[PDB]
Amino acid sequence: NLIQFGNMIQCANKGSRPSLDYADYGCYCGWGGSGTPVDELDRCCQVHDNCYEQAGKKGCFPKLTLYSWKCTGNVPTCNSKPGCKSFVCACDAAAAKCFAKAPYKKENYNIDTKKRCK
Amino acid sequence: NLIQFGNMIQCANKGSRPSLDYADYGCYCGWGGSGTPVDELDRCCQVHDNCYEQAGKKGCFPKLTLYSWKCTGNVPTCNSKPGCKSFVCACDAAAAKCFAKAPYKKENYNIDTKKRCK
């Protein structure tokens, strides 16, 4: 679920930045997502958006799915069983890893998505 | 539950030390629960053992309790508000913070607790 995703983000970036910092970023991080991502981190979110889309087509509610995961060697690691739990956990762990490698750019945080996204 | 606790430990210590390093340490970290704690870290585990005993007496199974928690700016924070979930979460959050500020001394890892703990 989304609280677990936030926990994963902190795991992957070794506490370098709070997970709330990623909640409304670029064109894709946060509600909806449209246009060309504005930078590397936003590209992570576009991928994540598409993964949640694919989870939804498989009958999952990715914001709600309660999976099992472990922060090990600074990598979010899915324990979960198959199905939605495995699938959504994979979406989140992947995004967490992607966020962690990408540079955070404050100028791209909380942007006017109607003006900058398409 | 124990997996979540491991995740809290990584949250509080910014992933600087694996969770397993704390599973058999001193007289109190892990299955042990007797004698005089061997150092500052071991004292954290003594407090955590006491907390788990209190949880049990509240009717909780602390190793199993499945709570809701958020790693917020490197601080494990309980979201669960009532019952065993909130109480056990608090035990774990406090220990995770305690572990992160205590110095780890490998000479106290995996000691013979039958011999050194009373």
Ligand SMILES: [Ca+2]
């Ligand atoms: Ca989005």
Ligand SMILES: [Ca+2]
């Ligand atoms: Ca113990």
